[model samples]
Target: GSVPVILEVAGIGKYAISIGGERQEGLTEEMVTQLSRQEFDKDNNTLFLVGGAKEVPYEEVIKALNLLHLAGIK
Candidate 1:
């Protein structure tokens, strides 16, 4: 069973979210691809969790944000 891939976009000094249990470290473009329509809640104004990892670059995070925007997660 897969846990819901939630992007918990809130709080300061807390800028990270998990993917599946397999990759529960942080969000990446690769992680974004795993998100589907069922992943997000509609009644929220989410400030994105911005940053990058060594394996997941900043450019990729931007790209991921764009796609997440397209996916209707704000």
Candidate 2:
């Protein structure tokens, strides 16, 4: 189990994944660089990566979620 990826998306809009906030789905005013293949729909905004990319480790991610939601992975 891993901490789910949650983002605060506003309005009924589409979103794409990017390393940084540089490459976004809409608003190309800030240099459209690095196109992302991961796209999310309305309630599908939440994502759960099952280990692959180098991040803050699984334990740290759980800590973050606990701090925000007072819960962790099973």
Candidate 3:
């Protein structure tokens, strides 16, 4: 079974990510890598995103996505 991982965009370079209903804020590449190592199962998890109220930069979103991909998270 697959789980839905929610990533809420707070603003440019800001994120609030949630898994299993527990949320964390102020995301970075390091944190994403750590979280990817700890929490994600590439074969059974899915990443979903909520657009920012303010401007969410494309590069920021893609960068996070790329990090997750490199970590083997889908």
Give the winner by TM-score.
3
Report how far residue 8 has shifted in candidate 2, in Å. 10
lDDT for every model? 0.47, 0.29, 0.65
Better of 1 and 2 by lDDT: 1
Error of 3 at 2 (Å): 7.2
Model 3 CA deviation exceeding 4 Å by range: 1-3, 11-13, 41-53
lDDT of 3 by residue, 1-74 (tens): 25566766666566677776788888966775676557655435455544444577776667667766787774
Identify the leading candidate in terms of lDDT: 3
lDDT of 1 by residue, 1-74 (tens): 23434443223222345544433434444455445334455324433344555566555556656766777764
lDDT for predicted candidate 2 compared with the true structure: 0.29
Q: Mind giving the per-residue lDDT tens digits that candidate 2 earns over 1-74? A: 12243322222222223332333344221121112113222223345332212433556444333332322211
> Could you tell me the TM-score of candidate 3?
0.65
The true-structure Cα RMSD of candidate 3 reads 3.0
- Candidate 2, clashing residue pairs? none
Tell me the alpha-carbon RMSD of every candidate: 8.5, 12.3, 3.0
Higher-scoring candidate on TM-score, 1 or 2:
1
